[PDB]
């Protein structure tokens, strides 16, 4: 380890600048820096994991349509952005569900607390208020969903990893799907593990009644029916790990659509595949913590619409109907309608 390396040098009295002189061969560190600070610099450099770097030979949207044409075995990684046009609000964007939950739930600190098992046991109401709004059986899938669906029908889709729990890909026709965070397909008692299908609890959910276990004693408060939604701290489904094992050496193109990639281990997928594999981002905001080759920024629907028209054939039969307005920032970044980075 790098850490051990520095420890041993500390036992000897080594000057960190001696190690940094050839670890940073062209850079001398500012005079007013602590010795230990310098040693920490050494640790970070030595223990920096090999990262994928942006491919210099892939930049343009024309390059993107080229990849879409010639690639079989595509991985598409979707997030909440892909469903906001369907009528399902974001976490990241302006006026999410949290703005309305914080109104009469003062104890709810963040959107992520809805998927916190401890908070859930304390008060499951905010979760089930969310569940009613997002519950399957009420929304039509977007152009993106249809796009991914067509890719699968054409045999080009290796897999669609989704973080979404709206289960809209079932409607769209995306069969090669992995629901990385589970769904509302079943619900189970926290206490006795009594399992039940999605329908059994739906009634209670739309009546704003917390679905309770009918087998456990009625006085037992934690006897709640929780849908198989993966909560934080919990394990991702077996399918996820099994699929990534096969897919990591099969993929020849990665597309990320409508996600901020802030949740692991799904956010590690761009880091888990071969460095030469091209990576395209389709998203309202850029993601500086990753190195995408082509950055298409805006509403994923209007971008996908543009991509489909350029692809012709079956793809052009999907979209709403010339090109689409964008600001191009060389070498690889495009700003379409709807692009925004929200803050206040």
């Amino acid at each position: 380890g790098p850490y051990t390396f520095v420890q041993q040098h500390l036992m000897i009295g080594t000057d960190p600048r001696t190690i940094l002189k050839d670890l940073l061969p062209e850079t001398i560190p500012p005079p007013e820096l602590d010795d230990m600070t310098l040693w920490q610099i050494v640790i970070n450099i030595l223990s920096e994991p090999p990262k994928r770097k942006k491919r210099k030979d892939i930049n343009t949207i024309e390059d993107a349509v080229k990849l879409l044409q010639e690639c079989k075995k595509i991985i598409v990684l979707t997030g909440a952005g892909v469903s906001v046009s369907c009528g399902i609000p974001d976490f990241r964007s302006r006026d999410g569900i949290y703005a309305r939950l914080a109104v009469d739930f003062p104890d709810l600190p963040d959107p992520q607390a809805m998927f916190d098992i401890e908070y859930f046991r304390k008060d499951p109401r905010p979760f089930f208020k969310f569940a009613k709004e997002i519950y399957p059986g009420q929304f039509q899938p977007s152009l993106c969903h249809k796009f991914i669906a067509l890719s699968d029908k054409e045999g080009k889709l290796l897999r669609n990893y989704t973080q979404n729990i709206d289960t809209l890909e079932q409607v769209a026709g995306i069969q090669r799907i992995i629901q990385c965070h589970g769904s509302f397909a079943t619900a189970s008692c926290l206490i006795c593990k009594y399992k039940v299908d999605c329908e059994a609890v739906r009634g209670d959910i739309f009546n704003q009644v917390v679905p309770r276990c009918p087998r456990c004693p009625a006085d037992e408060p934690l006897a709640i029916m929780k849908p198989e939604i993966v909560f934080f701290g919990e394990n991702l489904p077996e399918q996820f790990h099994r699929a990534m094992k096969y897919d990591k050496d099969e993929v020849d193109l990665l597309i990320v659509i409508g996600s901020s990639l802030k949740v692991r281990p799904v956010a590690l997928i761009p880091s888990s595949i071969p460095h030469e594999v091209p990576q395209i981002l389709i998203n309202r905001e850029p993601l500086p913590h990753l190195h995408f080759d082509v950055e298409l920024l805006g509403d994923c629907d209007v971008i996908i619409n543009e991509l489909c028209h350029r692809l012709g054939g079956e793809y052009a039969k999907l979209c709403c109907n010339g090109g689409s307005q964008y600001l191009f920032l060389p070498p690889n970044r495009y700003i379409f309608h709807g692009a925004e980075v929200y803050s206040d």
Partner: peptide, 7 residues
């Protein structure tokens, strides 16, 4: 293990 974590 890779557990669902906010990073």
């Amino acid at each position: 293990r890779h557990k669902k974590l906010l990073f």
